[PDB]
Amino acid sequence: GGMQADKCPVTGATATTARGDSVEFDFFAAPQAYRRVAAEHRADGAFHSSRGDSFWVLSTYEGICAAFRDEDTFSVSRERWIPLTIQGRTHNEWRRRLAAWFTPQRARDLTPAIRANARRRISAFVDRGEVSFSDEFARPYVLENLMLAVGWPLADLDHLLAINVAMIRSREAPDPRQAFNAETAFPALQEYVRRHVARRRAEPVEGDLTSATFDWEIDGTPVSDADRESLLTVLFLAGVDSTVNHMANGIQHLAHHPGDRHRFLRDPEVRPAAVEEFLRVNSCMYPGRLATREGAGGVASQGDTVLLPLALANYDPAVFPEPERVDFDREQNPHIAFGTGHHQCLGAAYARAQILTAWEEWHELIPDYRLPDPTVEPPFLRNVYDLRIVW
């Protein structure tokens, strides 16, 4: 019968296959769970989940970066979302058209507005001594900033906020008093986007992103309404929650760790580096890719789904020594909280400006604050949560 199946017949070379059984791993898990499962099961840079359709999970910084940077091997095809699912020359064309609206210089141009927004909002609840940080401050703050950058009329903020919240709460028990719910939130967004395209088509506006797309060409022809609506939908879906939840996880840490709060308070020059360290620490996205050939990443088969969890890349101890430590003075922080390769976040400079500015204005008006029940170990904030801060 068989012997030494470990060894290639005839030549006898030892198989270099990744060493592990599949696990029944749920991709909808928290970063701490990704890291625990990875620690127990990763073999040669990956582990495999048999759950559902099944998928590979890469587990090293080097491997995850390499996959992000090799679109031919790790495809973004899924279903058409501009620009997330576009590749190659056409994707670069979309990014070229979009670039001017999201440059570092434009983020700086918008920072006085962002700052006025934060200061206005925080000043309005400083007398209360408490706030639900994300529901009442961070989410409408971030959405207001997004609407300013993309050109959605600010009179529509309450509407778009209600859609956003209905999406976040889509797995909660239904609330029959709500005008938007799990089933209607996305169609409501699509209808809003269609109305917005019609508004700007009837009356184009200088410096308005939607109005500019009417003159855009891609692949040598005018942009279609379908692609225009897709793009606007993606900007809404992409441009709020990750920023909000990075803001909330960072402020929750400072509320619980007086030494780090005092550093942030007394040392303005460290604040940009602190934002980058929190971006590393609180990363939780797991972008997926489709393996286009056998042996992708050395483990995947053609047609396999491969996840690239930032919670693993940004905690790789070969790159980030003592990775669980929040260290504002961390000497080497090449984190990929915004991804890497061609699809690297369009909004990274804007998100950085929003987070830093909000925390700056927060500490000007609320220098000292805490969590209300300090007998609870503060959880990682994601999905539906309520971050109460008191002062």
Least gap, CB of 99 to ligand HEC (angstroms): 11
3-state secondary structure at position 23: strand
- Go through the chain and list every residue after which a break occurs, taking a C to next N gap over 2.5 angstroms, comma-separated: 78
If the CB atoms of residues 162 and 238 are measured against ligand HEC, the closer one turns out to be 238
DSSP character at residue 205: -
Mapping DSSP to helix (H, G, I), strand (E, B) and coil, where does residue 64 land? helix
Nearer to ligand HEC, 188 or 231 (CB): 231
Cβ distance to ligand HEC smaller for residue 49 or 282:
282
CB 14 within 8 A of CB 6: yes
Give the span between the Cα atoms of 246 and 251, in whole angstroms.
Answer: 9
Instruction: Give yes or no for a contact between 57 and 307, defined as CB atoms under 8 angstroms apart.
Output: yes
Q: Give CA–CA dist 182/53, Å, rounded.
A: 24
DSSP 383: S
* Nearest approach, Cβ of residue 389 and ligand HEC (Å): 20
Nearer to ligand HEC, 239 or 297 (CB): 239
**According to DSSP H, which parts of 209-318 are helical?**
209-213, 225-238, 241-256, 258-266, 271-281, 310-313
Cβ nearer to ligand HEC, comparing 234 with 270: 234
49 vs 243 by CB, closer to ligand HEC: 243
Q: Which is nearer to ligand HEC, 197 or 244 (CB)?
A: 244
Please report how close the Cβ of residue 91 comes to ligand HEC at its closest, in angstroms. 6
Closer of 41 and 57 to ligand HEC (Cβ): 57
CA distance 157 to 168: 16
In the numeric block, which tokens belong to residue 319?
């790159």
- CA-closest candidate to residue 44, choices 77, 20, 11: 20
Question: Least distance to ligand HEC from the beta carbon of 364, Å?
Answer: 22
Based on CB atoms, which residue is closest to ligand HEC, 228 or 343?
A: 343
Q: How far is the CB of 146 from ligand HEC (least distance, A)?
A: 6
CB of 353 to ligand HEC, least distance (A): 9
Please write down the long-range contacts of 79-87, taking CB distance under 8 Å and 24 or more positions apart. 80/227, 80/230, 81/230, 81/233, 81/234, 82/227, 82/230, 82/231, 82/234, 83/231, 83/234, 83/343, 83/346, 84/234, 84/238, 84/343, 87/342
Measured from the CB of residue 278, what is the shortest distance to ligand HEC in angstroms?
9
As a whole number of angstroms, the distance between CA 389 and CA 251 comes to: 9
Rounded to whole angstroms, how far apart are CA atoms 199 and 246?
A: 33
Q: How far is the CB of 148 from ligand HEC (least distance, A)?
A: 10
CA–CA separation, 231 and 169 (whole Å)? 23
> Residue with the closest Cβ to ligand HEC?
347
Residue 173: CB minimum distance to ligand HEC, A: 29
Which chain residues interact with ligand HEC by CB under 6 A? Answer: 83-84, 95, 102, 146, 149, 234-235, 238-239, 242-243, 246, 285, 287, 337-339, 343, 345-347, 350-351
